[PDB]
Design an enzyme around this catalytic site. Sequence first.
Site, PDB file in Angstrom:
ATOM      1  N   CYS A  41      -0.414   4.221   2.200  1.00 26.57           N
ATOM      2  CA  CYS A  41      -0.674   4.080   3.621  1.00 26.57           C
ATOM      3  C   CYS A  41      -0.258   2.708   4.170  1.00 26.57           C
ATOM      4  CB  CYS A  41      -2.111   4.439   4.003  1.00 26.57           C
ATOM      5  SG  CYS A  41      -3.369   3.619   3.162  1.00 26.57           S
ATOM      6  N   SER A  42      -1.153   1.744   4.238  1.00 27.88           N
ATOM      7  CA  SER A  42      -0.831   0.505   4.953  1.00 27.88           C
ATOM      8  C   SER A  42      -1.807  -0.615   4.686  1.00 27.88           C
ATOM      9  CB  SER A  42      -0.769   0.800   6.438  1.00 27.88           C
ATOM     10  OG  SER A  42      -1.990   1.366   6.891  1.00 27.88           O
ATOM     11  N   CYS A  43      -2.730  -0.390   3.768  1.00 24.65           N
ATOM     12  CA  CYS A  43      -3.817  -1.286   3.518  1.00 24.65           C
ATOM     13  C   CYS A  43      -3.407  -2.739   3.409  1.00 24.65           C
ATOM     14  CB  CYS A  43      -4.514  -0.773   2.257  1.00 24.65           C
ATOM     15  SG  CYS A  43      -4.873   0.939   2.538  1.00 24.65           S
TER      16      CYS A  43
ATOM     17  N   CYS B 140       0.856  -1.155   0.000  1.00 24.51           N
ATOM     18  CA  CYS B 140       0.000   0.000   0.000  1.00 24.51           C
ATOM     19  C   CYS B 140       0.913   1.232   0.000  1.00 24.51           C
ATOM     20  CB  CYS B 140      -0.945   0.011   1.175  1.00 24.51           C
ATOM     21  SG  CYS B 140      -2.031   1.459   1.166  1.00 24.51           S
TER      22      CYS B 140
HETATM   23 CO   LIG Z   1      -2.937   1.522   3.308  1.00 27.67          CO
END
Ligand SMILES: [Co+2]
Lengths: 227, 227, 202, 202
Positions: free
Chosen positions: D110-112, D107
Amino acid sequence: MNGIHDVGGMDGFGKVMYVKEEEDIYFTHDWERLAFGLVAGCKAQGLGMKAFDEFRIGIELMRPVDYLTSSYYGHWIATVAYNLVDTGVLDEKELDERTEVFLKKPDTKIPRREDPALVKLVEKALYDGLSPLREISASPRFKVGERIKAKNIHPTGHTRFPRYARDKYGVIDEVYGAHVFPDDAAHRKGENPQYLYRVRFEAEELWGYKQKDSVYIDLWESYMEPV
Amino acid sequence: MNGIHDVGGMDGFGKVMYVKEEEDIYFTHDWERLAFGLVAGCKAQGLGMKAFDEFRIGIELMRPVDYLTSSYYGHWIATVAYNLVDTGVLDEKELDERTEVFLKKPDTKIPRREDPALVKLVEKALYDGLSPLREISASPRFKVGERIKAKNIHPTGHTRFPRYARDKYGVIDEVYGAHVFPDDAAHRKGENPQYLYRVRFEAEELWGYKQKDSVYIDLWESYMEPV
Amino acid sequence: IDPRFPHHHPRPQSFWEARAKALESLLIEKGHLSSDAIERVIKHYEHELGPMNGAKVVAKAWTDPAFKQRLLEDSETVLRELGYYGLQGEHIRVVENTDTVHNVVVCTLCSCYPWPLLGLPPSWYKEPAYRARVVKEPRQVLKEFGLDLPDSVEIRVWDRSSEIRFMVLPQRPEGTEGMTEEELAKLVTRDSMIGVAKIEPP
Amino acid sequence: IDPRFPHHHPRPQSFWEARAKALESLLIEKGHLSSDAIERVIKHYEHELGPMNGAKVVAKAWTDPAFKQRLLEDSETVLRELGYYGLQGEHIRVVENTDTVHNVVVCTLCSCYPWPLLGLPPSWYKEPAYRARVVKEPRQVLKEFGLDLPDSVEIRVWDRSSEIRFMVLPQRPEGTEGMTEEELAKLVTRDSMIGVAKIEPP
Ligand SMILES: [Co+2]
Ligand SMILES: [Cl-]
Ligand SMILES: [Cl-]
Ligand SMILES: [Co+2]
């Protein structure tokens, strides 16, 4: 927004800190656990945020120096604070004062309350999730296999279109269906769903590089145009 | 390098801190003055750096978190340290130890030495400067008025081609002449001069925006190709 | 410091200070630098140079049509003849503000600025906000300086990606009739030579 | 703090901690949250979820050709039938590593990460180095994990810009003949389901 969060293609961030899975501790401070509880607890009730779109923009709006130093759950604290104030759930002055209280007296007691109905509600949210898939009356503009132009757009508000993919040619890999549109939803401007596509980009096109690498990115219809 | 330094077109850095000129103090700490003396003194003698190319890459290589927090003369300290170690003028271990000495005992005495010949040499450098203009046997590839393609290149080493201008069409405004080529010179790979051009880009092309704005950027010949 | 996250932790400014002293000490001990060489540089940039040089060039352009013509035709020759030349001022160009064209100078990649003509750059000039924003939303940036240009005025932003430097030649304001060249020079602000301000009537 | 340079000064992590407590206190006082609602979330993510769920899906795919076929044809239906569904796991896709195709998930923005199937993401997955680099130099990133692919192997990086999530289905290694489904599941690493590692022979 062309922010510090949009790091794809950047140089200089150094080596990846490899750690064995079993040693990769989830939480090292109680406030990090608390951050998770705050986010999920609020979201489950639609407080400050209903989906992840509004959540993301609050993080993206952080001061760059904070984004890079807060640690990951620091982002979560920042966006909960941002969104609860932005929507009128919390007052900024009251929040700042209370922050100061806990800064000067970290062992200040936290008020206790049991609400089993709220627990059930939160649990339901964790298990049911919240799909952004919608149906719309329009047909998809693009087809699998089509070579498209990923537009050179520069929204100042939220977008899911990474800068590294802008102004590039790519190929449609899949038509997912219509999804809630982040560039609107993050700003509380309606779901206004659009077709979401998976798009393959080649390394040669993204970077001018010569290896057998490609990137598959999900792009909303309005991010693209026909060639 | 696609680094934190290459900020053109980024969102989120906030308002410009306006200050009246007369109140805009040059230096607030003696180490900042010292940073200037170190840079110019070394450069005048070709120590660690001969032109600004090597100077810039040392800054660009900073950890992003340092780049954003060190303050401006912190960049200068970082690059002098980088380049003096990189070229073998200083040993890293010795530099780190001495750093530790001044960290633990900030009032440690600085050794004094007068070298009037060196003063004259430094003065000459300040007044004479160091032009990167060269002559080459080739003719310019591009002409004033020509619509060119600013290439999508992604060097991992030093470049003067801002990311916001890559993969764009622009118009040649001037042919300056051949200049020392930064992408090579910063890495001590030869002057290898190339024609330098001024290129006008329109807001519509850079950003998709609709105002009467344009950007004039100086680009080396190898950054561009004909249409 | 959790070794997964060393990148969260900036060097404190005390580190840079110590590093500076360490460099100074080692270089002097090794015979590479001297106390007086370092001081000579500090004197030059803190005291000898400044925006007054550019101000004199602007006032001369306003008062002497032939000079303004030569300056705009061949600024590098003209500026060198005046002695405004040196490190980071080897190739200086001049762009004129006009009623429908406004010029703004920036170094998006760092801080490049013509020291021999203008002295050291403004604090804000070197910082990310100005650098990031002025190439994309110059009207918004200018408004933060108090300059609210009409839509009909074209803005040209000059990003200093090479060693070529630019000075903005701002327009002479109203209310200056009968002023001497020296008196006009006192009107010329540093900010006006970067493009972030017009000059106010006296 | 020099007011020209507030942006040089990060919030300390003690600020975020205090802010978290302040939010917690105010929200509970106002009736928006409860102690037990917050604890319920912490229990779920720290203890109830984890990569073992994905591991079970991988082992089943390895041992049951018909299941692997259904999974690859319609992963979202199949995963939901198994109960691996929930917040950030509403739409999960599965991509198979093959001899000449290697898959890596990221991601960048972000961090998905698919919590219901894999639990919380790795520390490094959320940090800038991996996020920035894996889309541009995945071979270099993979080498830092000990995976040195030949030039002839194609790499596909799957950047999670929407709520669609992906799990990598890694290849069954040599040396596993006669192992039960449960025993194979113990071989499946979190890292292998992100694409940053192959599975070692036992
Ligand atoms: Co993310
Ligand atoms: Cl003007
Ligand atoms: Cl594999
Ligand atoms: Co510069």
